[PDB]
């Protein structure tokens, strides 16, 4: 399931 993108890598 898609959980979006995080602002950290």
């Amino acid at each position: 399931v898609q959980t979006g993108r995080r602002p950290y890598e």
Partner: antibody
Framework: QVQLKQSGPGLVQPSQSLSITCTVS????????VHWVRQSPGKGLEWLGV???????DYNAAFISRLSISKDNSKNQVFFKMNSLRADDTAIYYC?????????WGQGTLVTVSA | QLVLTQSSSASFSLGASAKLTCTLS???????IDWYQQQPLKPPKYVME???????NTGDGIPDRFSGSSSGADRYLSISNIQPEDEAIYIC?????????????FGGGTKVTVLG
Amino acid sequence: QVQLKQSGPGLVQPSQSLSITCTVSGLSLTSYGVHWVRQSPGKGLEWLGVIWSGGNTDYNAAFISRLSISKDNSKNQVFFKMNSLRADDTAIYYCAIYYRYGAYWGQGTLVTVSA
Amino acid sequence: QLVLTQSSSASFSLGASAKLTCTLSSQHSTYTIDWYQQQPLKPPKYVMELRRDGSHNTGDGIPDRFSGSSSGADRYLSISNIQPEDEAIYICGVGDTIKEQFVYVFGGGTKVTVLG
């Protein structure tokens, strides 16, 4: 500890350019992305763009035509540049670095767009 | 559109238990969000990462009385025994890939007033 120190002039004449440097001490930009964010008086936080550790970028589409972010890994500095400023570009501008789980923030640059 | 919805303000009595809501756009109901606490004219402070099963990771300098939970599109920040020090603007944030590009967006912020 980690510190993000912003520098650059804050007064900008309408239609001129805004340049801000973010100097990062205590961690390496080869490992972290740096975001740029701004808040204008009672108008909420706007995300502007980011430069990732590898040097690639992503920009808010409302700003990509006039916004540029680049960096110098050896100096540990990030350069934010926005052209053609208008009255409503008046805001405090912040650099930010996220990690698991938290964020470091620059002190902010108060930007006034005025003649 | 990727949109976070928060009420602009909320009020709680001293010592009460408070809950703030951030609602994700329907097509993004499974997304992880960030909560932030902000004082006027200051950089925001990171509060927590909050995932869709309601589990969370709290940032540095955040006391035990803060926690998070989820319910479908809703993300909650709970503060038990709400203190005057908890008066602040609370903001949620979320990232995504949209047309091959990273985007991040903030909610409008909720101003918390502690009565009494």
